[PDB]
Write a protein that binds this ligand. Sequence first.
Ligand SMILES: O=C1Nc2ccccc2C1=O
Ligand SMILES: [Cl-]
Length: 163
Amino acid sequence: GAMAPSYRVKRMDIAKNDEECVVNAANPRGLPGDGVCKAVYKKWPESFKNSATPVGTAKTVMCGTYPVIHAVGPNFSNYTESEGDRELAAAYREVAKEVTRLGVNSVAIPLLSTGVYSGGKDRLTQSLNHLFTAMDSTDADVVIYCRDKEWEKKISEAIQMRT
Ligand SMILES: O=C1Nc2ccccc2C1=O
Ligand SMILES: [Cl-]
């Protein structure tokens, strides 16, 4: 229950976050995969024990006392725009329920479905706006992690535009 709930963005490996829990951009089978999920597998391998969860869902597995929230955004290559948008909205909502359940003051979160699950489309505002819609009713400090300076720039732009 953080005192003045904020949004920030950082450009670095989420595996090196300074928050009380991490959201893994997970695949539905609980496999190490690539991208966020790979660095995450290296840092918190124990968290992948029974981490498999359906598209549009989030499952928490504790590494000791450190929660890893496995959130499965849809692969837009496999879904329609409409159904993909529904599953992506749902995954973020499930992240919010988990963050609330875990009582944490802060969460590190990537933009779900913006990398190899994007179906070769820019889904920054789509993914970010679904993140906001889900996390705006929580009181955790939210720190969004990205790899690209132009993604970093536009995310902050979008955060600042609400303040
Ligand atoms: O946040 C980000 N999502 C991305 C997807 C593809 C390439 C770069 C990025 C980012 O920096
Ligand atoms: Cl992705």
